[PDB]
Structure formats: C-alpha cells, structure tokens
Amino acid sequence: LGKFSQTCYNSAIQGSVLTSTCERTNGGYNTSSIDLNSVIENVDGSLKWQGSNFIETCRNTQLAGSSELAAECKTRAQQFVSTKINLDDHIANIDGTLKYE
Amino acid sequence: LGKFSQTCYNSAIQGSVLTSTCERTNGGYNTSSIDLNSVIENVDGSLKWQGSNFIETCRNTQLAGSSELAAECKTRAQQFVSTKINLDDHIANIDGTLKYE
Amino acid sequence: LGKFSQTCYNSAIQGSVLTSTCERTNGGYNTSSIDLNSVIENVDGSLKWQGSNFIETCRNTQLAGSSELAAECKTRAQQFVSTKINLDDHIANIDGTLKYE
Amino acid sequence: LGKFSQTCYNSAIQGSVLTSTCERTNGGYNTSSIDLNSVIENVDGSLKWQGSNFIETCRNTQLAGSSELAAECKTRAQQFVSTKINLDDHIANIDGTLKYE
C-alpha cells in the first residue's frame, strides 16, 4: 500500500478516468487506470467522495419529528495501528534457504 | 423547494420509503409514498442529499499539483464553483495498481 | 440493513454455503446464499473472520530488529452514528403527491 | 519451528519480501528471499499468521441456533476441536440479500 502522490508518476485524466504509473510492492512499475466517475460526485458545486447507499450502511431508519429521516449510519474512517509479528515463529533456515514451516 | 410537511400529515418512514397524506391543490387529501433510496446517501456517517455525476455537471476536470483533482462544478442553483479534491484520500497504489480504498 | 439473525429465517449451512430467507427493506422476503469460505478461516482450530492482504491494508513495511515484520495496518472497526436529514429540504407536496425537487 | 534469525544475518524486508543470508548445513552462507504475502495477513490491524481454508480443514459444518456457524476444526496438533463463530458479526441482510460487510 502506497500513497498515490508519493509512489506514482506520469498521471493523466481523460474524462473521468485516471491513469498513472505506480511503484510495484516488490520493485518496478505498472501503469493502470481507475474510473473516478463512480467514487467522486458533485455535491452543491464541490467535488466530494461519493457516499454509500443508506439501506446498505444505515440501520433503524425512522421518521424524526414531523419531517426528518433518522438513522444510525456507519462511518468509513481510516485508522492505522502500529503492529509487529515475529517471523521466527514460522520462517526457517533450511540449508541456506528461507522457508515457511 | 420541498416543504411537504407544511401541507401533509400522518407522515411515516418504513425501510427507505416516506408515506404521507397531503393536501391537494384544490382541496381534499391524497396519500402517497416516495422511495428516498436514490436521493439520500450516507457520507461519513451522516445522511446527506445525493449529488450529481461529476463528468455531466462539472467542466475543466484536470489534475492539479501532486495529488489534487480540480474542476469547475455546477451548483443546484445553476452557478459554477471552482473546487479541488485530494485523490490521496481514497485512491491507493496497491502493488502498482490504482485501487479505491 | 438488518442483522442476519433478527431479519432472516429458515437459514441453513451446507458445506461453506449459508442460505437464508431475509426481509427486504420495503416489505416481503428474498432467499439468497453466500459462500463463507473466502471470509472465514480456521486459525489454530478456531473459526475466525479472515483478514486482509497486508500489502493492500498495511503501509510502511519494514524489518524491526532481528526477526520482526513491522507495519502500520488499517483497522476495520467503524462506528454507527445517529444522524438526521430534513426531508423538507427537497421533498414537496405536488397536488397531493410526494415528489423530489 | 522457524527460528531463521539464529543462523542468518543481513536480514531485510522490502515490500512483502524478506531477504536474508543464511548458514548452509555443510558450512558457508546463502542469500535467499521469501515472499511473506501469502502466509501473513492483517486481522483487525494486527499482523497475524494466515490460517487455513475451513472447508478443507474442518468437518461437520452446520448452523447452530439462529446465527452461529459451528464446526470441528483441525488444530496444529492434528486433532479436531469444536468451534463456533457468530455470523451476525459480518453477515448482513441488505434488502433481502446476504452480504459480507
């Protein structure tokens, strides 16, 4: 996983389609495309990240007061935690060669 | 715009559907329903009004700087607003391939 | 959005495949199936929810000390937030019939 | 199991790939690489050792009560143990269709 702006170059937009040449995990580069048309929208003059259908991501829909739709809706925040795993658990030296066991 | 509640009564929400009994222009009442599923969305845990396809309603879509997408988008009131979105928010490089995350 | 156990019935599992008859959002029922094999795994004799590929969901992979793989990995916990939207914004009474404007 | 770090040196991780220089059984050293992407996963923000396919390594899969998948799964000691998982955790009813969320 890498940040678009930091690990890709020669980016281009044609219509709603984004193309860029990005670093591969284990070296070298790949050029690929993504259609932004379904993930970005125009809300009141502003580009924003398209949300989700409320029937998929909100529960307990109800009327509130005389005119409000109320619900409990899932967030989509991106949280990272620092983590480690000891490769000595399963990674061995078999006659000079790393192997999983 | 809107304001149905001013001339309706017995509104209810079931599922994604609003039902209400509303005054006819010349008098008397009519009960009707509307499915709110295509006009309201969940954006980051909040119910918001669904926006428009940005290719259809924005012009001059272009990459700007290292990671930004810029466009001039139409408001609901027929005006243009110059807007930027940071593609780094949700466009990731996964092993050399652009993927939304 | 409904909880499987609360809004479905006549559920069965055959092999890795879950079948059930579930409430539709706006009334009635539907029977569908889901293959649990790609989302559940056996970890040391316990069924657990399968995780994600660490290259898709973790960044900054590095070796820590002599034998540890270290990274910053995304969580998959999202809260539910109580939200409301005023349907009077865009829902109107047009001669006895609810319409979006 | 494992313990590569005891007889190896100049270890490094790049992307998902561990590289190390390891002692050969009959003396001398060899540098090799192992891709960790298929044996480690991100589970809830923690790096963990990947488990096995439950259909291949468990037996007697069935639904228990209204929401639980029950099985007997093989342990690293090669015996079967009783295990359950609450399908409510991630199996949702979306408008009548079972969907992982």
Q: Closest Cα of chain A to C13: distance in Å?
A: 24
Enumerate the residues of chain C whose CB falls inside 8 A of the CB of residue D58. 42, 47
Enumerate the residues of chain A whose CB falls inside 8 A of the CB of residue B89. 49
- Long-range contacts from D57-66, C-beta under 8 angstroms, 24+ separation: D57/C42, D58/C42, D58/C47, D58/D83, D61/C13, D61/C15, D61/C16, D62/C13, D63/C11, D63/C12, D63/C13, D63/C18, D65/C5, D66/C5, D66/C11
Q: Closest Cα of chain C to A30: distance in Å?
A: 16
Residue with tokens 């561990």: D18
Domain of D26, CATH number, reads: 2.30.60.10
CB contact under 8 Å between D84 and C47, yes or no, is yes
CB contact under 8 Å between C12 and D87, yes or no, is no
- Domain residues for the domain of B2 are 1-101
Please, which residues have CB within 8 angstroms of residue B50's CB and are 6 or more apart in sequence?
A41, A51, B38, B39, B40, B41
CB contact under 8 Å between C98 and B18, yes or no, is yes
Enumerate the residues of chain D whose CB falls inside 8 A of the CB of residue A57. 101
Instruction: Name beta bridge partners: A91.
Output: A100
Instruction: Name beta bridge partners: D72.
Output: D59, D82
Listing DSSP states for chain C in one string gives: -EEHHHHEEEEEEETTEEEEEEE-TTSSEEEEEEEGGGTEEEETTEEEE--EEHHHHEEEEEEETTTEEEEEEE-----EEEEEEEGGGTEEEETTEEEE-
Enumerate the residues of chain C whose CB falls inside 8 A of the CB of residue A55. 1, 25
Enumerate the residues of chain C whose CB falls inside 8 A of the CB of residue D93. 1-4, 7-8, 22-23
Q: Name the burial class of residue A34, with classes exposed (0-12), middle (13-18) and buried (19+) by CB atoms within 10 angstroms of its CB.
A: buried
Measured CA to CA, the distance from residue B68 to residue A60 in angstroms comes to 37
Q: Can you read off the two tokens belonging to residue B85? A: 């979105």
Among the partner-chain residues D22, D94, D99, the one whose CB lies closest to the CB of A93 is D22
Per residue in C33-55, is it b (16+ CB within 10 Å) or e — as a string? Answer: ebebeeebbbbebbbbbbbebbb
Structural domains counted in chain D: 1
Measured CA to CA, the distance from residue C16 to residue C38 in angstroms comes to 9
Q: Can you read off the two tokens belonging to residue B57? A: 């309603």
Measured CA to CA, the distance from residue C15 to residue C52 in angstroms comes to 23
D45 touches chain A (CB under 8 A): yes
Closest D-chain CA to A97 = D32
Q: How many CB atoms lie within 10 A of CB A24?
A: 16
Q: Name the burial class of residue C65, with classes exposed (0-12), middle (13-18) and buried (19+) by CB atoms within 10 angstroms of its CB.
A: exposed
Please, which residues have CB within 8 angstroms of residue A30's CB and are 6 or more apart in sequence?
A21, A22, A24, B95, B96, B97
Q: Closest Cα of chain C to A12: distance in Å?
A: 23
Resolution for this PDB entry, in angstroms? 1.9
